[PDB]
Structure to design on (132 residues):
């Protein structure tokens, strides 16, 4: 069970999809797709979101293998 | 760039490839490839590795968005 709180974390800060995408050097659709947890986030993608928002990966994404 | 400390964390505990393979639901070749970071750290796997080794994934894998 992977629980994504990408958008929740985004709300904890307040940076919009257009500006965040530009910061991550990605397309706006890329970050917006991640918000819907259905775009397949690879670590590099997750890392940059984590990095620019400065938020622990564990906070952003939650992994419950149980 | 990615710096892999998977070996270091495994030394922090003492879990080897056969056990991790069973825990991560993967083949031993998969985890062996991850140890050499040659297989490329799959994000889905990285999350479970973090959990099974019980260590923050940033400690396990070191990531630079450059």
């Amino acid at each position: 069970m992977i629980i994504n709180n990408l958008k929740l974390i985004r709300e904890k800060k307040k940076i919009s999809q257009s500006e965040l995408a530009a910061l991550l050097e990605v397309s706006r659709q890329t970050i917006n797709g991640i918000e819907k947890n259905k775009y397949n986030p690879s670590l590099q993608l997750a890392l940059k979101i984590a990095y620019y928002l400065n938020t622990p990966l564990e906070d952003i994404f939650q992994w419950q293998p149980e």
Notes: Chain B touches chain A through 16 residues (CB under 8 Å).
